[PDB]
Design a protein around this ligand. Structure first.
Ligand SMILES: N=C(N)c1cccc(-c2nocc2C(=O)Nc2ccc(-c3ccccc3S(N)(=O)=O)cc2)c1
Ligand SMILES: [Ca+2]
Ligand SMILES: [Cl-]
Length: 223
């Protein structure tokens, strides 16, 4: 997160960190046994870390649970980034509490202009590198489709939306990938990609979760 602020411990209780000896992607807890993340974060032997704030210190409230299945969307295209969504099943159901809680799937898509919360432990610099210890947050508005496409050097599919600030300085970034965009208490986005981070006229691009609700429910029910 570039140009954001320190969330405060466990103020984003659905935010999880994907770990393979180190943090590498975020994810969102959607029920006691399932996590929504990004297809491009796929890796085998993922450990899910829930209830995290400072990812480098054991503070308490953590739960570490191995991924038992990582289900990349069958139509995920690593070129075009279309369908950048992955479902992770935890080996064990998480113990849900005030600091480890699920976030609701949307019932309808979010609308342009709505301010949403984006969070993660990714890069906090637009040029250069600094990774935080504690969870960072950013409130950013969903941008219209036409300004998105006007800004982007790459094709924006109907499964993506732009959110953030065209003047630069405020954006998600590497390491936030797979993490949540929550608008009015609903998981509407997944940190997917962007042209660098926090550059002028180059907003963050996010997977449009509301397109996947039926797929998410069906997949979960058959696994
Ligand atoms: N600014 C962000 N919100 C953000 C979030 C996560 C990662 C990065 C990021 N930080 O550094 C690089 C990055 C990056 O995502 N690069 C990138 C650019 C374009 C595409 C892409 C999009 C659509 C179609 C095709 C492509 S592709 N694969 O041909 O380039 C994919 C990745 C930035
Ligand atoms: Ca910790
Ligand atoms: Cl920090």
């Amino acid at each position: 997160i570039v140009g954001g602020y320190t969330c405060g411990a466990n103020t984003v209780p659905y935010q999880v960190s994907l770990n393979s000896g180190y943090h590498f992607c975020g994810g969102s807890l959607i029920n006691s046994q399932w996590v929504v993340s990004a297809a491009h974060c796929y890796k085998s032997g993922i450990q899910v870390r829930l209830g995290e704030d400072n990812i480098n210190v054991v503070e308490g409230n953590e739960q570490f649970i191995s991924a038992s299945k990582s289900i990349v969307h069958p139509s995920y295209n690593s070129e075009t980034y279309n369908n950048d969504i992955m479902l992770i099943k935890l080996k064990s159901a998480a113990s849900l509490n005030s600091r480890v809680a699920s976030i609701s799937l949307p019932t309808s898509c979010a609308s342009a202009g709505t301010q949403c919360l984006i969070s993660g432990w990714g890069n906090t610099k637009s040029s250069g590198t600094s990774y935080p210890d504690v969870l960072k947050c950013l409130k950013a508005p969903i941008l219209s489709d036409s300004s998105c496409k006007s800004a982007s050097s790459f094709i924006i599919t109907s499964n993506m939306f732009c959110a953030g600030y065209l003047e630069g300085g405020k954006d998600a970034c590497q390491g936030d990938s797979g993490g949540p965009v929550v608008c009015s208490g609903k998981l509407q986005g997944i940190v997917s990609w962007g042209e660098g981070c926090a550059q002028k006229n180059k907003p963050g691009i996010y997977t449009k979760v509301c397109n996947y609700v039926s797929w998410i429910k069906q997949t979960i029910a058959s696994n």
